[PDB]
Amino acid sequence: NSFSGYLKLTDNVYIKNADIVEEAKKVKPTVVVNAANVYLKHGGGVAGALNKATNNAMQVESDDYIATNGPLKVGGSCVLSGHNLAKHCLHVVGPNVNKGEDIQLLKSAYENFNQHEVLLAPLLSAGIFGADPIHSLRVCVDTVRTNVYLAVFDKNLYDKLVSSFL
Numbered sequence: 001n002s003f004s005g006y007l008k009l010t011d012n013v014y015i016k017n018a019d020i021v022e023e024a025k026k027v028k029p030t031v032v033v034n035a036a037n038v039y040l041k042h043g044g045g046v047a048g049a050l051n052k053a054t055n056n057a058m059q060v061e062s063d064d065y066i067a068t069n070g071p072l073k074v075g076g077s078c079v080l081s082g083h084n085l086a087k088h089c090l091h092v093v094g095p096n097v098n099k100g101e102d103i104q105l106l107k108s109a110y111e112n113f114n115q116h117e118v119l120l121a122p123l124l125s126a127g128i129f130g131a132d133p134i135h136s137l138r139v140c141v142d143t144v145r146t147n148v149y150l151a152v153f154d155k156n157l158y159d160k161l162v163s164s165f166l
């Protein structure tokens, strides 16, 4: 958990313009959050980047979790191995508003972070899930009470977030 170059937005939310995969390799946090779908199929976005950094070990593991426990629900999560990136990976499903999923579930998605004292995470439901990233940051700030280090890859998005917040 040796985080560096973060900007403290609130008492418990910090932000940095960085690739979460690189942050994970440097810090080796206790928990790295994945922006997952209900079947834990890591095909693109941050899920694909995280899976690729474990050389498909996250996917083999996820396929075994799904065969044994069934799919997650939108707003839910599960804790799996973090492999070479972290001690644990917390897979969290935010709503896919581009597929008509309810934005009210984005609060439920963020409540999962509260079971862990410190997490390295991306913005939920942003990118391919189609929700407004600035709105996503607002729900994170209002919902998460534990210590969360948000890593934002796109510098244009990072600058919009820091401008809207501070």
Ligand SMILES: O=C(O)[C@@H]1CCC[C@H]1c1ccc2ncsc2c1
Pocket: 018, 019, 020, 021, 035, 045, 046, 049, 122, 123, 124, 126, 127, 151, 152, 153, 154, 157
């Ligand atoms: O922070 C971002 O720009 C987006 C917002 C939601 C998904 C994030 C993302 C997407 C892809 C990716 N690949 C490596 S780190 C990484 C992070």
